[PDB]
Symmetry: D2
Subunit: 248 residues, 4 copies
């Protein structure tokens, strides 16, 4: 019986790379998406071409709301329905945009704190409640202590996610559920970002003056879920090419 | 003219100790409170007896909601209404209770209270404080020295306090150009919960290397007063542990 | 042709497990040792029986002194002499014992504890870099408990904190040369041979994930990840392998 | 009776400002120096003009060596011989220069950089505590806010400063039962090197969010004064950044 993984925000970019690598390793996968239905199904189609009935999609908004807990319960339920088990949860989905101190602000709070922290918390609860090499991997941020200017809410969300990673590692250890993070520095740059701004970031990276591929981020995820990480819990692995070590 | 400070959750315990010490230092104070009206008014009375028209109370729920931004804005407005300025903001108010991951309040409410009080309200209050502004403007966030060795089953509380570290850093960076410093004070064990039995209190006390006792409220307030003072005018983005070595002690 | 790795303090325990796993992955290995000559030679024998001419021993005291730079250069030299290349350095050797603030002299304690845990890693890093399709990296055996240290282990703890600093500074400075520098930070793994069983069990019961210490092989697994092609964007990172021990309050 | 403090490397710059502020606070002081005899004596004479018999100087090399333990014991002993007590130790003296990994002997660089920044502090701490085997005893270590984002090619310096963090934590834990608190102050950019061109000084100044300027020596001293004060008596194992937010600024 193959293990099964849920990957949030898995239609594109880093989440897609993670889904693909888990699938290549032998997992059956739930590809969660919010707006990217076409891309989510295209990925499922590709994975199911390789191995029939090993990939399904699941739609949900992960914005904080009165219905978020039910939405997160259903994401976990979708894995059990499709595959009869849920071994791995990857909290990858994330809103990312500036929120200057000086969309309504309450909506920004709901999206940024919801996707990056509250949904991971609720998914973690539902994952644990429903329960071998069980683990959770949270996509963190190597730059949390040297944050982007005017990204307070995003940064708060990513700090909260560090807190969840630690608290859940502690509390779920008795159940044999490990809880770890992967912290990219600069990986795939935002599609909306200009080419000049992208190159400004790349030239800051000590190791090769380039961003991490999605696959390089996924490699750390694969390690953490693997049998080679069986004693590792509450750890956050930076995958940042030394970017966080570089002073102003 | 005397400077003015807002202290959230200032009716009792650490919040009161901070309000009292700021007042003793020459600040006029807004004593924010949620449910503790009697205690808030009693404190304001004591302070106004010491110096007339130097303390007012301000009631607000800091639970997350769509009106929280308006509530936070009104807290800062109340300081300007009373005193014509707002030099210091102390984010002290905090919900604190367990939220077990594996099994009264709905999870939605728990998220709203624990994340709202510890992180979102601080953020909105920070926004409003900055938007309203020789000078010594600053914000102090009451953090938690144990955030990396958290209490079992307190994930949402811990998440909120981590978020608060993030705000302290992000806001220090962004508000520096406005001369608004943003720092934190991180108690370990200070005043134990009223509902806690003495045996459980003593268990915590005997963990603290420096004197096997909890921090007094005044000791926490002392670090706050330092950070708002002219003796800290180059300090921003710093979180000062006031924990008697507790966070250094392994399992 | 096969890459080559230096592992310090490789004759026994975690260093041996690291040497063995690297060897199983395809590395030729320099098994550095100080006092454990018989165990070092026995391991080299086992590894060479598996693949001929893939293991050598190299003896060196890694206590701080005016000759330590020469000793460290000679360790790296021994890898080039045996194998013609040096792809991986694992800084594992370590003195570990209490040095209370209130038989060995204090100058010897400083020399041993700071030398093995920090200065030798530095000098080995220098010599490794100076001697340099490729995948060059250094892995430093750190300590997950550096911020919640054992009582009366100040010099040891200072050494391990210095090793964190080295890992970071060297990651930064050697990145332009394609040399990655990372760490692995055990919590409780193989307990000291001298420790009494009661105290061993005390430590085991503190670990959230399984109430047991890490095996040497579990520590080695993280080293193998960091030197692998699956870590080629990772530098300046220290991976805790502690079963959650460092998360547990007093 | 007046308390007494030892300040290492106190002839100039930050150490001098610390010595002055301690003296202004009421401390008698041991002004340790290595090469700067004239500056040390000039300070001593200035302080003794203020209050007779309140300042002495103590010469020592704090490079790592076989004799360093004796030298450190003698520094502490000097404070007892001068003043009959030793309440405060400030580990400020520090060698600082690049040590590139790829191309003074290296063993000398090790001895100087690790000796001054880590081993001498450790030995001074041992000696301080052994002599202590109303009171407010404490140690303040001058750390570095940039230890996790170090200058390129300063590995041995950075190693020494990381080691000093370890000492600060380990000694806080171990000495807490004796009532001796151990803390740090971590400047980011404070007084720039004397030779440094203003154009290079400005490159660093412009990076500092809070005021685009370096910390004065006096601002660093202010944080030391807080930590040794009665307002910090629950604070141990804490390192206070005094960096204007520099360490929060990404590349
Ligand atoms: N890229 C980087 O350089 C970098 C750096 C540091 C950390 N990270 C972290 O690594 C992870 C992946 O990064 P990425 O750049 O690949 O992420 P991304 O493209 O910004 O977002 C990934 C997905 O998150 C989903 N998402 C956004 N808002 C959502 C909402 N309200 N509800 C449900 N899903 C929502 C979206 O799914 P749909 O498209 O289906 O709507 C989106 O495709 C994130 O956690 C990110 O913070 C990335
Ligand atoms: N006590 C400790 O040992 C300790 C340890 C570490 C950190 N800290 C931190 O230091 C600060 C002070 O601690 P403390 O023990 O004095 O705090 P506390 O007694 O638990 O709470 C302080 C005040 O928070 C206010 N509050 C709670 N929920 C609120 C809501 N929904 N809306 C508005 N206000 C709300 C309450 O005001 P009303 O009474 O008016 O309802 C309460 O009096 C907190 O931030 C805490 O996290 C304390
Ligand atoms: N074991 C744990 O629970 C644990 C926890 C945290 C971190 N770590 C770290 O992980 C690494 C491996 O731990 P371990 O317990 O396997 O180490 P260990 O047994 O204490 O020491 C490994 C080797 O270090 C060598 N060594 C000691 N002093 C030396 C000197 N003066 N010169 C040269 N070599 C010297 C010894 O080699 P010879 O036998 O040949 O003399 C010894 O076998 C160490 O860096 C340790 O600090 C271990
Ligand atoms: N300045 C900054 O921007 C900055 C930034 C971060 C941290 N810090 C830290 O704050 C502290 C003060 O900084 P600073 O710039 O004022 O220091 P500094 O001028 O570089 O050095 C202070 C003193 O250290 C003494 N010293 C150097 N080598 C010694 C040796 N081998 N033995 C004994 N004493 C020796 C010297 O004494 P003599 O002159 O008598 O020879 C020197 O005057 C240091 O610990 C430093 O690392 C400073
Ligand atoms: C100002 O825009 C910036 C500045 C710095 C950046 O890396 C240091 C990036 C990379 C993209 C990114 C980082 S977290 C993150 N999180 C999500 N959910 N998506 C992303 N695309 C990113 C973008
Ligand atoms: C299980 O109850 C515990 C466990 C550990 C504790 O300190 C190490 C405390 C002290 C009270 C407390 C800490 S954060 C905090 N935050 C608020 N808003 N209120 C409080 N009363 C506390 C209580
Ligand atoms: C009081 O003795 C202790 C206390 C705590 C411990 O783990 C948390 C250990 C495990 C052995 C150990 C840790 S670093 C270390 N370093 C070396 N070179 N060797 C070792 N054997 C160890 C022993
Ligand atoms: C290349 O020169 C540099 C680069 C960056 C710097 O600040 C971040 C400084 C300030 C001086 C300094 C920092 S630690 C330090 N330590 C000692 N013992 N002395 C100093 N003078 C300094 C100088």
């Amino acid at each position: 019986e193959a293990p099964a993984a849920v990957v949030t925000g898995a239609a594109k970019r880093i989440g897609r790379a993670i889904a693909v690598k888990l699938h290549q390793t032998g997992y059956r996968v739930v590809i969660h998406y919010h707006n990217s239905a076409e891309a989510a199904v295209s990925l499922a189609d590709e994975l199911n071409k390789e191995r029939s009935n090993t990939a399904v999609v699941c739609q949900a908004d992960l914005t904080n709301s009165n219905v978020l807990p039910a939405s997160c319960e259903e994401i976990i339920n979708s894995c059990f329905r499709a595959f009869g088990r849920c071994d791995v949860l990857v909290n990858n989905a994330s809103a990312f945009y500036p929120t200057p101190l000086v969309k309504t602000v309450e909506t920004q709070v709901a999206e940024l704190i919801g996707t990056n922290a509250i949904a991971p918390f609720l998914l973690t609860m539902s994952f644990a409640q429903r329960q071998s090499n069980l683990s959770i991997v949270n996509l963190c941020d190597a730059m949390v202590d040297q944050p982007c200017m005017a990204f307070s809410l995003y940064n708060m969300g990513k700090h909260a996610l560090v807190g969840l990673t630690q608290s859940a590692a502690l509390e779920l250890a008795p159940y044999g559920i490990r809880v770890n993070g992967v912290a990219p520095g600069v990986s795939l740059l935002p599609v909306a970002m200009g080419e000049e701004e992208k190159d400004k970031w790349r030239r800051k990276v000590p190791l090769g003056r380039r961003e991490a591929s999605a696959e390089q981020i996924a490699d750390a995820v694969i390690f953490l879920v693997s049998g080679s990480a069986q004693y590792i819990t509450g750890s956050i692995i930076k995958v940042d090419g030394g970017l966080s070590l570089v002073h102003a």
